[PDB]
Amino acid sequence: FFQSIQALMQTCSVLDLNAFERQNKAEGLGMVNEDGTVINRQNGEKVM
Amino acid sequence: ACFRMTPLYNLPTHRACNMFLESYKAAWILTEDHSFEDRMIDDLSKAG
Amino acid sequence: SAAETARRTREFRSPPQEQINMLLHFKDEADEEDCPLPEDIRQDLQDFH
């Protein structure tokens, strides 16, 4: 059990900065040519 | 592109239905049934 | 009234899926209603739902 807790928390993420830039230009676009706009909208899965 | 998007009244009937169902995920996802939560552990488990 | 043209924007702009969201939001919503429909087709949902 303590193997799991020790290993698991080492895979936790931190505030990365490179991934932030990938949002900062991806958010520049507002809608696809014609497909329901950006379906993911927030798409928060990146920084944390 | 956004300036050339099509009006709603020219869509085929079959296609104009699939968009309704997918978009009408705005009456289940927000409504709450509650119900099975407190009546569950009451009739089940206890008084079993 | 000029500005009425600004109000009527979903009707020619936005993709078709966006129009459905605006016209369907108030139907099965509660209390507040924006850009509503005639109060004749908004009764079967409150019966069907």
Next chain:
Amino acid sequence: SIGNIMNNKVFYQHPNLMRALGMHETVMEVMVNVLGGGETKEIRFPKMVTSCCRFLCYFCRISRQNQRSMFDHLSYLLENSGIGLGMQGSTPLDVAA
């Protein structure tokens, strides 16, 4: 079977069906079973990876959402792609690109 799939006039008009039936999911395991082997000597049953990988590429060039749905398996695809090299027509690396 796959050759008759790409002529039915319906796998061009309603892509939303084919992600709901998800045949791209099922056909994917077909490739992994035949290619599963210790080394390059396990290239049993060739001429079918090429005959099927061609179908995947055209699926990826029908809609943007079709591109996303299969993109998520990129890490899975490259894991078993850079081993069986030497044939023509297609290879899993091509559909990865």
Next chain:
Amino acid sequence: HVLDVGFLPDMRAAASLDTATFSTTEMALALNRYLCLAVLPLITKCAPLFAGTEHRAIMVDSMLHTVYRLSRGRSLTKAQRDVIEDCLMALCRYIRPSMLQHLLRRLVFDVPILNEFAKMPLKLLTNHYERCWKYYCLPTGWANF
């Protein structure tokens, strides 16, 4: 750089006549002539451009002989903008056209140099009259026009 790139361009219409099997040379005219048609930097003290000027015209000789309606525009726009950079000394290039440009005045190859000729007169309506045979060639073309 033109003393090495034009060496390959020297074999322009060296096969554009009989049959020309491997037309991969036309594929090299999609990343070379396009690069040359992006530099208005031109001076003097040389006449090697004259050999290159006709070479582009020699490549545009084929009105349909392996050109592609889309790939032909690259070579057409390669010279149409190459005129507004020369030192107004385009000598033999005018004589290359002369009346041959006036000839076939009912073909699709007419608009190849028709609009190009108008660009010369619309940039010399107060000069470029310091010649002799060319001045005679202008009237020779004007009367035959």
Next chain:
Amino acid sequence: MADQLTEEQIAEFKEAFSLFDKDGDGTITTKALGTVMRSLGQNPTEAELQDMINEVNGTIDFPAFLTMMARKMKDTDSEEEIREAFRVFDKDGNGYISAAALRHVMTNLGEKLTDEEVDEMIREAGQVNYEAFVQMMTA
């Protein structure tokens, strides 16, 4: 992509291709594709059909035909969509548009574009026709 074509013209192309199917397998040669392609109205020269086999052996199938037809219609569709989409922007449709009118109508196209972006967009340029807008946005 192959998503710029509606279903009815895809059906028409499928019918045209199937009407002259070789043996039901959809394998046709170079001479006959020109005939089938000139059968339904479009009659271009021989250069484009020379380059079509170059992009993709004597073995032509329906998917390749559909892709090449799709991307030879899509360029025309894209080149033409820049003129019809502007029709709503001007009342008469000719091209003349007052600069004051766009201050309250050009902020509500559904792109969630507020006043600042259109400030910078129109400031970087009376009545302006459609071609100046083409140069303005296409860049």
Next chain:
Amino acid sequence: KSCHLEEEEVEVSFEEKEMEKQRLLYQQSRLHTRGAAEM
């Protein structure tokens, strides 16, 4: 959710606040005696 249901406002009196921490203590009391917790 069967436990934490009870888990700009007047001050809470002494007598009432034990009811919440007793109800919470009982709501999960049935859920640790009955095996559970050691899973």
